[PDB]
Design an enzyme around this catalytic site. Sequence first.
Site, short mmCIF file in Angstrom:
data_model
loop_
_atom_site.label_atom_id
_atom_site.label_comp_id
_atom_site.label_asym_id
_atom_site.label_seq_id
_atom_site.Cartn_x
_atom_site.Cartn_y
_atom_site.Cartn_z
N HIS A 184 0.84 -1.19 0.00
CA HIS A 184 0.00 0.00 0.00
C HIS A 184 0.89 1.26 0.00
CE1 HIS A 184 0.96 0.61 4.33
NE2 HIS A 184 0.92 1.83 3.86
N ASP A 202 -0.53 -7.07 2.49
CA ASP A 202 0.16 -5.81 2.34
C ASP A 202 1.64 -6.11 2.40
OD1 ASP A 202 0.68 -3.17 2.06
OD2 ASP A 202 0.21 -2.61 4.13
N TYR A 262 -10.67 -4.69 16.82
CA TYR A 262 -11.05 -4.25 15.48
C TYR A 262 -12.31 -4.91 14.93
CZ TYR A 262 -6.74 -1.60 15.09
OH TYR A 262 -5.76 -0.65 15.30
N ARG A 263 -13.43 -4.67 15.60
CA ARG A 263 -14.69 -5.21 15.11
C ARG A 263 -14.88 -4.48 13.79
NH1 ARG A 263 -19.87 -5.49 18.42
NH2 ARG A 263 -19.72 -7.51 19.51
N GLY A 277 3.92 7.14 7.88
CA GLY A 277 5.32 7.34 7.57
C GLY A 277 6.15 6.12 7.92
N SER A 306 4.97 3.12 7.62
CA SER A 306 4.49 2.06 6.74
C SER A 306 5.66 1.44 5.98
CB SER A 306 3.43 2.63 5.78
OG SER A 306 2.20 2.95 6.46
N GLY A 307 5.63 0.11 5.85
CA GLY A 307 6.71 -0.58 5.17
C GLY A 307 7.84 -0.88 6.13
C1 LIG Z 1 2.10 4.37 6.91
O1 LIG Z 1 3.15 4.35 7.54
C2 LIG Z 1 0.76 4.18 7.68
C3 LIG Z 1 0.95 3.69 9.15
C4 LIG Z 1 -0.34 3.58 9.99
C5 LIG Z 1 -0.14 2.64 11.18
N1 LIG Z 1 -0.94 3.08 12.35
C6 LIG Z 1 -0.99 2.49 13.56
N2 LIG Z 1 -1.77 3.02 14.52
N3 LIG Z 1 -0.26 1.39 13.81
N4 LIG Z 1 -0.15 3.29 7.01
C7 LIG Z 1 -1.36 3.66 6.56
O2 LIG Z 1 -1.81 4.80 6.67
C8 LIG Z 1 -2.17 2.56 5.91
N5 LIG Z 1 -3.63 2.83 6.02
C9 LIG Z 1 -4.28 2.70 7.23
O3 LIG Z 1 -3.67 2.35 8.25
C10 LIG Z 1 -5.68 2.94 7.38
N6 LIG Z 1 -6.33 2.79 8.64
C11 LIG Z 1 -6.37 3.33 6.20
N7 LIG Z 1 -5.73 3.48 5.02
C12 LIG Z 1 -4.40 3.23 4.95
C13 LIG Z 1 -3.77 3.43 3.62
C14 LIG Z 1 -3.76 2.41 2.63
C15 LIG Z 1 -3.14 2.64 1.36
C16 LIG Z 1 -2.52 3.90 1.08
C17 LIG Z 1 -2.53 4.94 2.07
C18 LIG Z 1 -1.89 6.28 1.79
C19 LIG Z 1 -3.15 4.69 3.32
C20 LIG Z 1 1.96 5.06 5.56
N8 LIG Z 1 1.68 4.45 4.46
C21 LIG Z 1 1.61 5.36 3.40
C22 LIG Z 1 1.85 6.66 3.81
S1 LIG Z 1 2.16 6.75 5.47
#
Ligand SMILES: *[C@](=O)([C]([C][C][C][N]C([N])=[N])[N]C(=O)[C]N1C(=O)C([N])=[C]N=C1C1=[C][C]=[C]C([C])=[C]1)C1=N[C]=[C]S1
Length: 237
Positions: free
Chosen positions: A44, A93, A162-163, A186, A188-189
């Site tokens: 993602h 993911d 997470y219901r 930020g 993420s990954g």
């Molecule tokens: C990430 O780093 C984030 C981290 C969020 C982790 N949060 C907690 N509390 N552990 N990832 C996302 O935003 C992924 N995401 C979601 O977590 C939710 N609830 C809804 N949508 C998304 C999402 C999916 C695909 C693309 C995006 C932009 C968001 C980052 N990943 C990308 C930028 S920051």
Amino acid sequence: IVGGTASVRGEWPWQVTLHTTSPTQRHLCGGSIIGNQWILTAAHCFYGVESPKILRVYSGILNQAEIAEDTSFFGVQEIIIHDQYKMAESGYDIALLKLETTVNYADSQRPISLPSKGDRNVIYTDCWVTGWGYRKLRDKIQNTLQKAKIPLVTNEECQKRYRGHKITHKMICAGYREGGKDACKGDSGGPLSCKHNEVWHLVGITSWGEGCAQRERPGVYTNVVEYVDWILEKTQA
Ligand SMILES: *[C@](=O)([C]([C][C][C][N]C([N])=[N])[N]C(=O)[C]N1C(=O)C([N])=[C]N=C1C1=[C][C]=[C]C([C])=[C]1)C1=N[C]=[C]S1
């Protein structure tokens, strides 16, 4: 990273910062070195990315300030997204980045060992989440790599928090019942390093969550071990 602290330089040598150069260069996602030419990260994280040409991977970084126009980086030859991926919250993911050149291992940059199937019964009591993500909601990329120790929670426990969602066995969660420490936008990954037996293991990949570090809202991660066969198949030429 919320509720964390500054990392020591070289403390997490497998951590990489993935940048995008469009429109202007900025940190996009975190990632983990698992091979001389392979980065494991979130799928993602490539939403809106039509070409690997705009990606840049930096290894051995502690502070984003170290990254300038004259800083060396690894180009991305190919982006491999799991064919079953649709969205972070649904699972799968996971993505592989095949670098254009090989990484020369050093104390500042080396690969993290993937978990083995015969470790799903292992009790990881020393896990950490790291990254340059937000320290909260509606924030911004932090300069110094942050780290935070966070306990893993059972899948049954995560499902309760997470219901409305389906927490599968291909996911793994971590967090404090009271919140306070967690990954954020930020991160993420990023990797979810778990120390078990004088050896580090890539247990999860930062994926999603409801808000950041809220109480009774554990961070959700890709359960890497469930993908060792996928990872083997995609990395073999
Ligand atoms: C990430 O780093 C984030 C981290 C969020 C982790 N949060 C907690 N509390 N552990 N990832 C996302 O935003 C992924 N995401 C979601 O977590 C939710 N609830 C809804 N949508 C998304 C999402 C999916 C695909 C693309 C995006 C932009 C968001 C980052 N990943 C990308 C930028 S920051």
